[PDB]
């Protein structure tokens, strides 16, 4: 079960250096012993090996410089979880400390002097080209500009923000996954020996990295707010790291014309793994050119820095705020539907959030979570998960072909997940969760059976003080059965699950102090999409479709969208008095 991992993007691979990640409860002594063992084993095979770093505090393992010939031997080692080949990363009131993993910084620049601390942590790869020389250059530019965007006196977002610099990107703005990993370990060791809310800005990106995402998840679980650039490759950000880590706040870049940023032939990364977008074109900030100089830059780094700033401001006001609460407020205070989605590839539009970060001017906050596409297999499933602190209040599904078996809100590892099931002959499906933060919530999913008899049809939260937040429907007839057109369960009251008689129904029932929910609906006879929205003050919790004819239904902020090929959109709107 010991696996080997390498970058998908061949030019970004760095063979010879490997990250050996050991099993969960492996202690420091066991990492050292395993490293000494690898070295001794290699030496017997007549190979020189060098242990560069022994990871502890963040994840268990070590960093090793060795021939790839020795991989097969290192996978046979005890306690080994997996081995990941190192690869390149590229440059893109209370005291809140903001860590910056980037290039060097001009700490004496008037814009950021006395607010920026240089940690002395430096871990960078050597520059490409046998005759490369920095010369009059201080390899300051990027980092200096980004500290300016975050905390700069005249052009900064969070002017009252303490910052700490870690040199992780060389003169050519290049770093390694291994160097970043060491940087992150330094941040965790720092917070272990120190008190204070933390924000970590990672304005860099490389190809999907299992270990980078793992280290990022570990830090996030330790209550650290990690903000990252989505990537400047006009591509699915899920293919990139730390971009792909769900725990990190992933930021895409937009220009003044509310358009996604174009960077030459490429531009801002898009899709599912992008949490939100922020100003990222022609961004004025400090210039390493002089102590009083400015420069306008572009890229998802600039955009990430804005969010790191907004995070710092929110945390200076309420330092106790959780990463869940912060992400929900970040989404909440954003500008909705401003972005022109035309620039993104058609199939990625649905998955790309239409939010631009903005500062804020007993609440129920919700966010939509899109799953990855399932396979084309008839038994294939898609799964959308919430954050540990959140509640799965609703679960929907969407297929481009419309061949769907429906969806389920099922517990998986003691936590409710939104699982969507593909159908016989279907392209594949997406699972769309609605992840919420509801104050003193006691929530449960009750499962109702298919109802083909006359009566027993009405699925609702029959419990006193328990209110319906959302409904899921799963088609209960097997593929080798006899297909008959699905019949709808009659409607009596509004506050009941809309569904087919032949389907099982999963009802989310929440009990909370001042929770009140309502059902809104809107139908059109011959549409491509039907829509219904929750009023100002109300939060969309559930989104469902009344009528195969329908491709699916999904939440788009406080709007329930039903996509068709009368078509009704059924929404549950909640609020907390």
């Amino acid at each position, epitope marked *: 079960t010991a696996t080997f991992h390498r970058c998908a993007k061949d030019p970004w691979r760095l063979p010879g250096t490997y990250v050996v990640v050991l099993k969960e409860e492996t202690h420091l002594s066991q990492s050292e012993r395993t490293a000494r063992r690898l070295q001794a084993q290699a030496a017997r095979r007549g190979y020189l090996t060098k242990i560069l770093h022994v990871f502890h505090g963040l994840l268990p393992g070590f960093l090793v410089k060795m021939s790839g010939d020795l991989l097969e031997l290192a996978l046979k080692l005890p306690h080994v979880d997996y081995i990941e080949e190192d690869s390149s990363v590229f440059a893109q009131g209370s005291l809140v400390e903001v860590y910056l993993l980037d290039t060097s910084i001009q700490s004496d620049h008037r814009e950021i002097e006395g607010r920026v601390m240089v940690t002395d942590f430096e871990n960078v790869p050597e520059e490409d080209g046998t005759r490369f020389h920095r010369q009059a250059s201080k390899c300051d530019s990027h980092g200096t500009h980004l500290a300016g965007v975050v905390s700069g006196r005249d052009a900064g977002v969070a002017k009252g923000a303490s910052m700490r610099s870690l040199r992780v990107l060389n003169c050519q703005g290049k770093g390694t996954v291994s160097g970043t990993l060491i940087g992150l370990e330094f941040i965790r060791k720092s917070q272990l020996v120190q008190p204070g809310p933390l924000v970590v800005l990672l304005p860099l990106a490389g190809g999907y990295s299992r270990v980078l995402n793992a280290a990022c998840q570990r830090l996030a679980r330790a209550g650290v707010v990690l903000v990252t650039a989505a990537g400047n490759f006009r591509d699915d950000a899920c293919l990139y790291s730390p971009a792909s880590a769900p725990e990190v706040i992933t930021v895409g870049a937009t220009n003044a014309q509310d358009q996604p940023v174009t960077l030459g032939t490429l531009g801002t990364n898009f899709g599912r793994c992008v949490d939100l977008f922020a100003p990222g074109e022609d961004i004025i900030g400090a210039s390493s050119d002089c102590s009083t100089c400015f420069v306008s830059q572009s890229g998802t780094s600039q955009a990430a820095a804005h969010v790191a700033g907004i995070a710092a401001m929110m945390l200076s006001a309420e330092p106790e705020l959780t990463l869940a609460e912060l992400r929900q407020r970040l989404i909440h205070f954003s500008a909705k539907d401003v972005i022109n989605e035309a620039w993104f590839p058609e199939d990625q539009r649905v998955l790309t959030p239409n939010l631009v970060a903005a500062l804020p001017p007993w609440q129920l906050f919700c966010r939509t979570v899109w799953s990855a596409h399932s396979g084309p297999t008839r038994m294939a499933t898609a799964i959308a998960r919430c954050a540990p602190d959140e509640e799965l209040l609703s679960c929907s599904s969407f297929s481009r072909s419309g061949k769907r078996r429906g969806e389920r809100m099922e517990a998986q590892g003691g936590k409710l997940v939104c699982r969507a099931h593909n159908a016989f002959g279907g392209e594949g499906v997406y699972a769309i969760a609605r992840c919420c933060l509801l104050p003193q919530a006691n929530c*449960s*999913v009750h499962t109702a*059976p298919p109802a083909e008899a006359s009566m*027993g049809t009405r699925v609702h939260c029959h419990q006193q003080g328990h209110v319906l937040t959302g409904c899921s429907s799963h088609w209960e007839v097997e593929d080798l059965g006899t297909h008959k057109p699905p019949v709808l369960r009659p409607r009596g009251q509004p506050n009941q699950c809309v569904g087919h008689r032949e389907a099982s129904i999963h009802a989310s029932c929440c009990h909370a102090p001042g929770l009140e929910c309502k059902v809104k609906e809107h139908g059109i006879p011959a549409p491509e999409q039907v829509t219904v929205a929750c009023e100002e003050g109300w939060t969309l919790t559930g989104c469902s479709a009344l009528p195969s004819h329908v491709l699916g239904a999904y939440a788009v902020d406080n709007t329930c969208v039903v996509r068709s090929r009368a078509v009704t959109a059924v929404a549950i709107c909640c609020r907390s008095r």
Partner: antibody
Amino acid sequence: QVQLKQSGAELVRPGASVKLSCKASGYIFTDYYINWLKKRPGQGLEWIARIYPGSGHTYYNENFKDKATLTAEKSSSNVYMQLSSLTSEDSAVYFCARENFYGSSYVDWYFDVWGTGTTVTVSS
Amino acid sequence: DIVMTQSQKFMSTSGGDRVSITCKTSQNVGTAVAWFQQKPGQSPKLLIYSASNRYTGVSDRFTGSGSGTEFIFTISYAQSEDLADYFCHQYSSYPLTFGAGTKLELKR
């Protein structure tokens, strides 16, 4: 006169299969859901699956999906439950039961009539 | 899956006239709890439905109470004729889950 007659006790070799029967009478067969329930000596009843005769559509407990198969014969007026690849863990008393609905709510029903059970002995 | 935790013995109260059993649920099932009598080699008999409603023919000596996660089943003036196993079940969520059963014991 509303009743559910269950088949006789069965002895099955481990790895074999059994088709249990539940003869319904004194009511409209195709209009009421019928359920299968497992009872082990010290344990509480386990809900296996339900079938609506009339459509023959089934809903199972995930835990019994591969084990059990429900079927209905309108002519014979009886529901069947087939249990595949038996084990000593399947030696139990199987009970048959009708759901009688009194309202539109999914909780406006009860198990008014039951069969006396069929004893299954999985042994060589 | 909702967990049903039924009391192992009947609890005597007012001079042995009322004997009771509690049935506690893993999650709030509202009032969706039924109570059955089971005499050995016989089909279970519905006594209380919807936590407190008494099925047809059922004696006024059988009572049910409770809502949410705690439900009581009581037998006033228990007779030798009432010696059987008693069990509860929730019907708020599928898969349906049942209590282990409690055998009535009587002093004499």
